[PDB]
Design a protein around this ligand. Sequence first.
Ligand SMILES: Nc1ncnc2c1ncn2[C@@H]1O[C@H](COP(=O)(O)OP(=O)(O)OP(=O)(O)O)[C@@H](O)[C@H]1O
Ligand SMILES: [Mg+2]
Lengths: 358, 143, 143, 175, 355, 118, 118, 51
Amino acid sequence: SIRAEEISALIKQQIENYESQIQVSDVGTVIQVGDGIARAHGLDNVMSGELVEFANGVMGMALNLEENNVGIVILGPYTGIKEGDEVRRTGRIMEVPVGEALIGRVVNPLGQPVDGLGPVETTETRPIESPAPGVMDRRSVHEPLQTGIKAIDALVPIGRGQRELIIGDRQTGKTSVAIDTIINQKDQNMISIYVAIGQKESTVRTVVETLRKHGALDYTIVVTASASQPAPLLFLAPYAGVAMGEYFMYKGKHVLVVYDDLSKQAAAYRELSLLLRRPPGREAYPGDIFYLHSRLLERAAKLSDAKGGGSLTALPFVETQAGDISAYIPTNVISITDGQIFLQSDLFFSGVRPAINA
Amino acid sequence: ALDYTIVVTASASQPAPLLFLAPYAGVAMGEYFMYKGKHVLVVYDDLSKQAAAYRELSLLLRRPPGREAYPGDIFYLHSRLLERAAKLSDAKGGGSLTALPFVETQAGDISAYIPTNVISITDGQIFLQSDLFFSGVRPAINA
Amino acid sequence: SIRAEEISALIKQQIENYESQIQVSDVGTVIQVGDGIARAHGLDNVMSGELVEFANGVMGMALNLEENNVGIVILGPYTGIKEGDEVRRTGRIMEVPVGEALIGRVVNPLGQPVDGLGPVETTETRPIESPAPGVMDRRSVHE
Amino acid sequence: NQEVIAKRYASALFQIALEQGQLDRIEEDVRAVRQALAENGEFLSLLSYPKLSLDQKKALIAEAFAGVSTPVQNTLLLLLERHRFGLVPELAEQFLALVDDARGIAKAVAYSARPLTDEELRALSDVFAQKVGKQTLEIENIIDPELIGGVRLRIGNRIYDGSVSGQLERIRRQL
Amino acid sequence: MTRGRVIQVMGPVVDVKFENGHLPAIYNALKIQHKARNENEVDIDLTLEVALHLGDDTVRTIAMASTDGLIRGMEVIDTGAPISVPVGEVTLGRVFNVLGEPIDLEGDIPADARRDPIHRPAPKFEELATEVEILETGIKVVDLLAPYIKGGKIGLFGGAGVGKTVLIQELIHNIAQEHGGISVFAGVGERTREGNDLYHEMKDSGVISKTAMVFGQMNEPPGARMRVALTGLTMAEYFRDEQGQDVLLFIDNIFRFTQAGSEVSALLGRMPSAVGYQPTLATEMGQLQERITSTAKGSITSIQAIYVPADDYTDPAPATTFSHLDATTNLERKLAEMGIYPAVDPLASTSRALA
Amino acid sequence: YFRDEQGQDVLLFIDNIFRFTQAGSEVSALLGRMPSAVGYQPTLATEMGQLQERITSTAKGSITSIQAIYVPADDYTDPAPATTFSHLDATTNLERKLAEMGIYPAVDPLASTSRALA
Amino acid sequence: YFRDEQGQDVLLFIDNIFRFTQAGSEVSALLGRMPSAVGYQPTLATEMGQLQERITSTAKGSITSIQAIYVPADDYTDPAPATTFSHLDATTNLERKLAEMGIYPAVDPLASTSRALA
Amino acid sequence: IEREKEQAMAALREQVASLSVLIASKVIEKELTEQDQRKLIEAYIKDVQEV
Ligand SMILES: Nc1ncnc2c1ncn2[C@@H]1O[C@H](COP(=O)(O)OP(=O)(O)OP(=O)(O)O)[C@@H](O)[C@H]1O
Ligand SMILES: [Mg+2]
């Protein structure tokens, strides 16, 4: 039988022996590491969506803020991250370095230079999760986005400010249409952004080389996230592209943004949500898989004259299986984009290139 | 034929681990004569039932299930069984173990999980169609 | 999120014996009985895939080694097994009796005679989980 | 799902306190642990900190919870090494609910318009001890200016309400 | 100290607990060498690959061999690295398992040899080749109708007596003859007697002295069959990085890589993706096949067999292999009965380089 | 407000009322609910019954609601379109087979029904 | 009792043994078992065999058993009809086209098979 | 019409009845309950004791 005052004061002196040794508010320690998803004890003052930085130097995304811990999605190689590693805050919510000096560079979805031409010195950053233009913030599209392809510019015309899907099977010329419409924007006042999502990095290398041969790297930006990169970087590649495009959009200039295979982004977010043990829907894509692409593609608009008048025309790609236009991810993107351009394999293997089914 | 055979029985009233351990007792009784240089035939009547018994044990032991609630190591189970059927070299004694596993299909489909697994393990297959069995062709081997 | 080992009988003797844990290490008491599957607290030195013996003489096989219990799979009639029975580690991995004497007899997967023609007089045993002959230990099929 | 686990832990400690013969010491230690952890909430956040080793956390519990008996300290260290130290106040509530049934005492919460005398509460306990089955009964009196001119009692999960039940029963029976 | 001990064994999955701050990183190798103290124990030589961090200083691993006989409390040493697999001239003419240990009966490789890690990030954007160049094979159907690419991935559709092994073997001979490179055959999860037949065919044709063979067969756990293409690939990477030459890398039945990853995912307890495949299907296929590239100094070109299960080219494992294929060569039995050797179907075989 | 307080005829045009149930399905996994058929909330019927049984005509005023309803992956047996057939007086089922023939409006003439056709 | 004491050749009629398995699948979800393939209990083969292996002919007597089987939606591939069929030795298929013709008993001669017809 | 009369009559009745409750409580407060509180309580125990 001991007095509760004695035990209470002894617990008090044990706490105020250790109140200065520990740090919990801006510093966290990892409980679990697995499959590119950390989970860290601590970080009492972290906020939802904030960039966190591990002791390795790899960045992380704080999705969930549970009562006991913080759920961290790792934005890079997770093999250097162990239990007991220190996590510290950065103070900013999920930003990529965006500026004028990013034109002509090949960067990752975190804005870091990948082509090895040195650092990319920028002065501003824009948030990844930025709201779209409103109803009254927009304007009807009235300016031609001219591709240089006769079947597109005749039959399926694209305006400066719309969302035009380029849909088709494997090896039907989607990337060729994208590079043909990025090369044509040279003498026009257009800044291009090519986002490579889950491609082979050899093909992205040849894409950057054929953009350099035609002088297109004076106005284009390449955001690449290849197949070997983890699904968190694949998840944030098109949002990095649109956050780089919004700078020139809200400064009054016009931007083309190409998403090479958004179906790779859908499969990567499907991977990340199944590793978060979220219950899936049809074709095992989660329920958030429409909001994934609709939060992306509704951020591409034609602004009114009260907001500068700049635009953001977006060309997403969806890779279908056996020409099924009535699958789940194609009918998700068709109900988001304005038009679609269907590239048929029956015409592509018969020599009709570009194989646009009219 | 009982002068040279061994019969290992695990019936449906027996508990599921005896069903699970009957083929491993089969190879453990065959490998004795295989490594003594003799030639052994081992016959597995309905390995699909052994797969269902291991599914039962893994679900009652709360192991995480895969396709058709079979566990992740059910292909490892049948492969760890059937790869013990070998033809040894002359330094190992030259003995053999030929295996004749059986998989029972339901209304003649082989796109199910356990038939695709055991077809992908073995060195060829023999189809016994019920369409040829009904029409008079016995043995009903689809050539 | 309750654990299997949180039983007021077990928690009592671990608060009794906190400063000196009673090292059982060869004997365990059953936690849960059901469907031919027994969880048992204890058996600290039990192996995976090991033949283990209950109190009534029924054998079992230990598949899941978990953090504070053993997932024992019961190799016989389990209706006589209650909570609190002692489980005795036999010290042997699952193996069958093996020899010339098995020829012409009906055997269960444990190796016991089922004909009723008498005992099976074998000398040596071999484990049922044995590695396959390696790819340099084989020869092309020609017989 | 914490009450069913704390019931098992408290029942194990309860059987130890019965077979040892030191039930008053274990009860005083459990009350001291509950009051010390209610007065200080940062101790759970200190022992949930993962960089502290398990030997160091056992040193903190063996240093802080000194003077209490041996099975209470063994229970606290066992809850530490099983990572179930968050339910120690629930363990204290379940253990005191066990030892109140062991002594034969029951807790009740009384509401009356006026604070009753010391003899009337003993009379109510002597009436209701035969209805509940306990030998001794406890009355907790609250001022509660809502109810008028009567007493209502909630003992266990049963309410003996007769204060304002007349007016509510009347307006339910007329209309 | 970096020695912890086993807490859980459940099939091929083993949980090992270390001290705090001394856990191994993900994908490291963990060795269990145990000599039986009593008659109640089993001698154990077992190797675990770290898969997860479960918390409470524990580590969930996957096994490379059988876990039968493991005792809770048996000590586990930390190698400090992933699976170190020997590379160089000592691997040519030799047959290896997934651990980089010689299956062959001549001898073992000494401990002073260079050993490379299995898990390596793909070569950077700085290091890739800018151009697309053609891997000249000397086979007229290949060099005319379906041209191969240095750094490319090529699908073989065939097997069961059409001439896949003869085409494999002539490719090794022609590349090692003219281009000066070597080949690496990675037999991922296939029949052991067919691996024996392929070994003796490469042995008596003289082709084996210029190749390095890696076999992880069906009897091994799924955690072993998931890492066979990577441990042949890390042998090919030495010859394109330190030697700087054009290297072949054969993966017999790349579909076994996908379903072995699916089985490891089901054992690890993940929620399955569509068709029962792991959620990490596309990124495991990418982390295999983005290391098969043409860099500035060398290249790995890869001829791969694909099963196409249920004859469905829209099945997710063919649909994720095909997004990396740069050519397709189709072996037809009607041309092998006709007398045409090689039996490559001239109209069905397509290539991306034929432009 | 209009049909109750003013007693006036009201037109409701709602484009993609499927997005109501889909936005419920996106939150239901994080609300601690167990999944249901096709990944939809367990409350897929009563969340749309608290909304759609409320869009009614009364004795004060009427609401004629015209609702566009998305059909996911062109699957009319999906649980969110299948449970909203029971709420509607008249349905027009648009088909892609008729839209690809150049037939606009691509209304399936057979599967489109009404309570009025009598 | 009649088999093991009277030594008789006993009939034992089980109407719709599919219900014996689906009753087990109804109980096993509430007992706390993981669901097996097709929603059937995981212990379906053993619970079927512990019924079907007590129906044997010993040296003393015999128990033969004619068992009606309802196949749901004529799907012969779900696991509970498969494990009822794996214990069967013969089938007698009662056809409506022979009962309307006047043939009593209306056993379909071609579709009713037996293991003993050898 | 006949239903309408019967429902209005019950409703009004309920409003008067509501008023009557509110006051019943107010007036009982108004009386001096030193005598009553001891009397009531003593009766209540006795009353509880019997049921
Ligand atoms: N208009 C054209 N005329 C001639 N050749 C063309 C034309 N368009 C595309 N091609 C050729 O077709 C080949 C494949 O097209 P492309 O790679 O652009 O299709 P894809 O949809 O990007 O393929 P994947 O989906 O596999 O990335 C290219 O190598 C290109 O040379
Ligand atoms: Mg492309």
